[PDB]
Structure formats: structure tokens, C-alpha cells
Amino acid sequence: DDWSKPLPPSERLEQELFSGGDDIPVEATGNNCPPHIESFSDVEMGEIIMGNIELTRYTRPTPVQKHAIPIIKEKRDLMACAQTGSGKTAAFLLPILSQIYSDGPGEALRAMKERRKQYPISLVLAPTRELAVQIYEEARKFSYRSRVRPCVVYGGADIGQQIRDLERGCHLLVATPGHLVDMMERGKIGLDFCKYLVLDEADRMLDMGFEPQIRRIVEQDTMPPKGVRHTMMFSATFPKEIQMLARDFLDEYIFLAVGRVGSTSENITQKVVWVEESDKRSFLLDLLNATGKDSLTLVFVETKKGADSLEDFLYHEGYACTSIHGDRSQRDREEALHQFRSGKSPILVATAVAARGLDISNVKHVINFDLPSDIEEYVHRIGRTGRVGNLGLATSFFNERNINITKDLLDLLVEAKQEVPSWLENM
Numbered sequence: 077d078d079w080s081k082p083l084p085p086s087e088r089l090e091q092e093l094f095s096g097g098d099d100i101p102v103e104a105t106g107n108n109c110p111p112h113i114e115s116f117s118d119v120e121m122g123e124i125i126m127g128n129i130e131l132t133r134y135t136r137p138t139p140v141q142k143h144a145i146p147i148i149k150e151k152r153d154l155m156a157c158a159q160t161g162s163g164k165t166a167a168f169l170l171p172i173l174s175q176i177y178s179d180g181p182g183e184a185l186r187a188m189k190e191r192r193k194q195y196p197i198s199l200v201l202a203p204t205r206e207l208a209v210q211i212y213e214e215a216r217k218f219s220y221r222s223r224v225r226p227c228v229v230y231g232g233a234d235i236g237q238q239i240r241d242l243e244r245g246c247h248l249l250v251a252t253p254g255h256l257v258d259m260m261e262r263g264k265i266g267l268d269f270c271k272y273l274v275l276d277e278a279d280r281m282l283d284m285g286f287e288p289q290i291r292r293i294v295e296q297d298t299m300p301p302k303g304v305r306h307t308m309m310f311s312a313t314f315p316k317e318i319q320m321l322a323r324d325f326l327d328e329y330i331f332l333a334v335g336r337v338g339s340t341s342e343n344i345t346q347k348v349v350w351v352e353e354s355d356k357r358s359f360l361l362d363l364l365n366a367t368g369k370d371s372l373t374l375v376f377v378e379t380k381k382g383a384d385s386l387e388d389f390l391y392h393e394g395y396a397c398t399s400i401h402g403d404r405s406q407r408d409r410e411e412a413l414h415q416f417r418s419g420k421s422p423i424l425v426a427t428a429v430a431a432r433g434l435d436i437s438n439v440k441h442v443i444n445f446d447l448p449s450d451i452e453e454y455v456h457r458i459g460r461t462g463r464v465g466n467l468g469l470a471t472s473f474f475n476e477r478n479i480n481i482t483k484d485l486l487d488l489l490v491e492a493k494q495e496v497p498s499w500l501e502n503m
Contacts, residue, residue, distance in 0.1 A: 079180045082124045082221040090131065093217050097133030100162070102143055106330035110150045112143040119149055121174040128218050129170075138163035140334045144308075145171050153329035154308040155322045157337040160464045164276065164310045165214045172198055172272045172306075173218050173248075181223075181247070184269045194227075194242050194265055196249040198272035199299075201290065203252065203281040204437040205230040211276065212250045224248055231255045231435055239264060253281065253289035254433045260297065267299040271306060275325070278311040279318055283459030285432025287317075294325060302327040312464075315339040315455070340455075340492040343462035344470055348485065348497055351473040356445060357389060363443060363471060364395060364423065371440045372416065375425045376457055378446040386445065387425045397423035400430045428457060436460065444472035451484035479503060 102112070113119055116129055116137055129135065137145065140158040147154050148171035158164050176197060180186070185195065200215075202208040212228035219226055227246040229238050235255070242249075242264055249256075249265065259265040273294065275281065281290060299305060307325050311318050314337055322329065336342075351359045360375070367373055377383045380401040387399035398412040398421035413434060415421035424436070428448065442461045448454055454472075461468030474485075482503050489496050 077180070077186075077223070079223050080122055080124065080177045082127060083223065085221060089220065093220060094131045094133070098139075100139045100335045102139055103333040104143060104330055105333075107328060109330050110146045110152065113137065113146050114142065116170075119146060121149075121170065122177045124177050124220075124222050125170055125174045125218065128220050131220070132217055134166075138167070140164060140332070141167040141170075143332055143334075144168065147330050147332070148172065148306070148308060149174065151175075151306055153302070153306065153326040154332065155326055155329050156308070156310050156332040156334070157312065157314050158310060158332070158334040159312050160277065162334055165211050166218075168200075168274050168276075168308050168310070169211070169215055169218055172274070173215075173222070173224060176224055176247070176272075177222060182269060182271070191264070192243055193263055194246040194249075195267075195269045196227075196246050196265070197224075197269060198248040198274070199256075199267065199270050199293075200248070200250045200274040200276060201253055201256070201281065201293070202250060202276050203284050203286065205232065205252065205435060206437055207277060208250050208252055215248055215250065219248070226250065229255050229259055252435070253286040253293060257289045257292055260293070267293070267297055270299050271304075273299070273305055273307045273325075275307075275309045275311075275321075278309050278321065279313045279315065280311075280459065282317055282321070283456045284434075284436070285456070287321075289433065290321075291324075313337070313339055313341060317452075338491075340488065341459060341462050342492070343464065343466075344458055344468045344492070346458065346489060346492065346494045347469070347471045348474050348489070348500065349471070350475060350497070350499065352475050353477075356473050357386075359473065360386075360443065360445060361393065363441075364390075367441065370419060371422060372419070372438055373423045373441040373443060374431070374436070374439045374460060375423065375443045375445050376428055376431075376448075377425060378427070380427060380430075382446065383425045383427055383430075390423060390425070395423055396421050397425060399425040400434070401425075401427050402430060428453060440466070440468060442468070442470045444470070447472055447474060447478045447481060449478075449480055451481055451488060454481070454485070455488070474500075 140162045144167040208230040215226040224247045226248040229251040383401040390397040416424045458470035
């Protein structure tokens with residue numbers, strides 16, 4: 077079974093997949109970095125990949141593709157810092173799929189050929205359903221006329237059909253961490269033969285609360301260790317927790333910096349206002365009355381009974397809202413999520429612990445009704461808003477109960493080049 081020979085073409089499938097169609101400074105750091113290429117033909121990618129690249133009508137490799145692709149093709153771990161929209165997806169999908177076409181399905185899967193559990197060769201983790209579907213559809217384009225079969229698992233109403241497509245064969249799996257863990261405990265996915273692990277938008281994944289699930293997938297199961305598996309991490313920022321995750325997950329990696337890379341999100345506006353406890357409700361009402369149309373707002377409160385009280389207050393003032401917290405049943409929490417995702421209830425009151433690991437995406441305004449006691453968790457909360465194109469907003473209510481975080485909060489506002497309240501510097 078030759079996995080480099082392209083299968084016969086399907087003119088029907090071609091029309092479905094292919095119907096569409098500069099010098100950012102790059103800094104590489106590491107031991108013996110393979111040199112960047114200038115065109116896709118500068119590396120033998122194979123008959124299948126070259127043929128699919130021509131079908132996508134995209135022939136000039138992006139800067140991040142110029143450096144990341146030869147690093148992966150030389151079986152080297154990669155920690156790349158690039159913003160969403162630079163071509164990260166193809167940068168890891170193309171060399172991974174090219175090597176699988178040369179190596180074949182390995183000896184383990186070949187022996188196993190003679191509800192069926194699937195053992196993917198490549199695992200790609202993503203924070204959101206939106207990005208998971210995007211990576212999946214690109215993988216379909218680059219596995220055309222190939223024997224590699226990609227799948228995606230991201231939950232939602234059609235998770236039953238996603239479990240189905242798994243059982244039709246899966247060599248490359250795109251998933252969000254929480255649903256992948258569920259697939260693993262249900263005996264539908266095994267990682268014993270995963271040779272390629274990709275963590276895309278890893279800073280966002282940790283912001284959404286997925287780190288326990290990710291370390292469960294990567295360290296506490298049957299995935300081959302670093303030095304056997306080839307691992308790639310992409311992340312727009314490089315904070316200390318991403319440093320530590322790279323150090324744990326990567327083996328003698330190359331660090332790639334596309335553009336001005338920092339540790340804060342340069343796509344978030346942070347407003348900190350002093351609000352006493354008894355004034356927080358009136359202040360929130362003023363913020364919400366400035367909220368536009370189709371604007372998903374996430375309000376963090378400290379306790380379940382606080383999310384309890386606030387949602388009751390907001391609904392009786394006429395606001396379309398919902399709440400997720402521990403004192404609500406499972407079914408009520410899944411419906412709260414759907415109404416938030418659909419925009420029927422665009423204001424979601426939640427405790428931070430209840431929102432961790434939930435399919436919450438496209439948040440435009442993060443409101444810290446109550447602030448946390450760690451600057452680490454604060455960074456996590458506001459990371460739920462902001463994107464490469466849209467500037468997110470993070471408003472926080474601050475009073476005497478938050479003097480512990482004063483110094484850390486001021487240092488973060490200055491580093492992010494945000495407005496610093498003149499009072500904050502004094503306490």
C-alpha cells in the first residue's frame with residue numbers, strides 16, 4: 077500500500093473542496109535551525125501535496141510557512157509565535173501530511189488492518205469549534221487523492237454524527253480538549269500511535285481553562301513521549317505558563333517569532349474603575365446600556381449565589397440574559413450555553429470555575445463584576461475577548477477588596493500599554 081501515489085481523482089469532490097482564491101521580520105532561536113525556504117518546491121513534499129497546493133491556487137508560502145515548514149520536515153519540535161491570519165494552519169498541516177505520505181501508516185496500523193476504536197497518527201488541538209472546523213476543512217483540501225482521512229470532534233448538536241465519522245476511519249484528528257478527553261474515556265480514541273501533536277492557539281486554550289485536559293491528553297495517557305512524537309505549539313503570545321508548557325511538551329525545540337511578540341494581548345482594551353459593592357449593579361446597568369447589537373457579554377462573579385442574585389436582577393430589569401453556575405442542573409447549563417452562543421441571551425453571568433472548559437467563543441465584552449485574587453486568573457478571563465481583527469473590551473470593578481492584586485494589576489496595564497487609573501498607582 078503506497079501512501080505517496082495519489083488515488084484516482086473525483087471531479088465531484090474537487091469542485092466541493094477548491095472553489096476559492098509580506099515581509100514580516102522573523103526571528104528563530106534554537107540549536108541547528110534548518111534554513112527557511114522561499115518556495116514550496118524547495119523541499120520535496122511529494123506528488124500529493126504539490127498537486128493539492130496547485131488546486132488551492134495559493135502558491136507563495138507565507139513568512140511563517142517559510143520557516144516552520146522546513147523545521148517540521150526535518151523532524152524538529154517547533155514553538156512558533158504567530159498571529160491568527162499568518163497561515164499557521166498550512167504551516168503545520170503541509171509538512172505533517174507530506175511525511176505521512178512517505179512513511180505510510182506505520183507498522184502498528186498496518187498490522188491492525190487484518191464501534192471500532194480509532195488510533196490517529198496526528199492530533200491537532202484547538203480551543204474553539206470555529207477554529208477546529210477551519211483546521212479540519214484545510215486538512216480535507218490537503219488530503220485529497222490521499223489515503224489519510226481527517227476527522228473533527230467539537231461537540232454541539234451533531235456530536236452523534238461526529239462520533240460516526242470517527243468510526244469510518246481517522247488518521248488525523250482535530251479536536252477541542254474537553255471533547256477529546258470524553259472521546260477517550262468512552263473508548264473511541266486511542267493515542268498509542270500518535271506521531272504528530274499540534275497545539276494551535278495554545279495561549280487561548282489555557283485562557284479557556286483547558287490545561288488539565290491538555291496535560292491529561294498529552295502526559296497522563298498512552299501518547300508517545302517527546303523525542304518519539306513530533307510536537308508543534310502555535311501561540312500569539314508567550315507568557316510564563318506557555319513557556320512552562322513548551323518546556324514540558326517540546327524536546328530541543330526551535331523558537332519562531334513572527335512579528336512583534338509579547339506576553340500580553342495587544343488586542344484588548346482594559347478599563348479599571350473604582351466601584352463600591354452596593355454600586356456595582358447600577359454601574360453594570362450603565363455598561364450594558366452602552367452595549368451595541370449582537371455583542372456577546374460575559375460577566376464574571378465570585379460565587380454561585382452571586383451569579384444567582386445577579387441574573388435575577390438583570391432579567392427583572394428587562395435584559396435578555398442567562399447564567400451558568402454550580403447550583404444549576406446539567407440540562408439548564410447546556411441550554412444557557414446554547415442561548416448565549418445563538419445570541420438569544422447575549423449576556424452570560426457565570427463564575428470563572430463554571431466557565432472553564434466550556435465551548436464559549438466570540439465574546440466581545442468581558443466584565444469582571446468581581447475581581448479574582450490572582451493576576452494569573454485575571455489574564456485568563458480577559459483572554460476570552462479580543463481577536464486579530466476585532467478589539468475586545470475588558471472592564472473590571474475594583475474596590476478595597478482587591479488591594480492584594482493592586483501592584484500586579486498595575487504592572488500588567490503598563491506592559492499592555494493600557495490606560496492606568498491615576499489612583500491605582502497610589503495604593
